[PDB]
Scaffold this active site. Structure first.
Site: not given
Ligand SMILES: [Cu+2]
Length: 98
Positions: A39, A86
């Site tokens: 992340h 992501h």
């Molecule tokens: Cu993420």
């Protein structure tokens, strides 16, 4: 009281929960790295200044489930953030200050 969000749902889903939280002028938010690594948490200078948004923008890169990050919201605004690399889904969330 600070607010906090976890980077991805317990079960192992992308969507942040809570997707929006409220926080005070000069309080903190903490983000805790749950799962679905890596992340980032990148913050848009959308209706807020570049420097502020930059300091709030975690260019930090969370993979290990442990390394949380913190940010202070000095100015009473709304901040919006997202997770560029992501994979496609739409990691929407935004914080709302009091
Ligand atoms: Cu993420």
């Amino acid at each position: 009281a600070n607010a906090t969000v976890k980077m991805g749902s317990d079960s192992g889903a992308l969507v942040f929960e809570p997707s929006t939280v409220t926080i005070k002028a000069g309080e903190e938010v903490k983000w805790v790295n749950n799962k679905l690594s890596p992340h980032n948490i990148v913050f848009a200078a959308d209706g807020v200044d570049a420097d502020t948004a930059a300091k709030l923008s975690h260019k930090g890169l969370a993979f290990a489930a442990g390394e949380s990050f913190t940010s202070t919201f000095t100015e009473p605004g709304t901040y919006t953030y997202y997770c560029e690399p992501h994979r496609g889904a739409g990691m929407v969330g935004k914080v709302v200050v009091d």
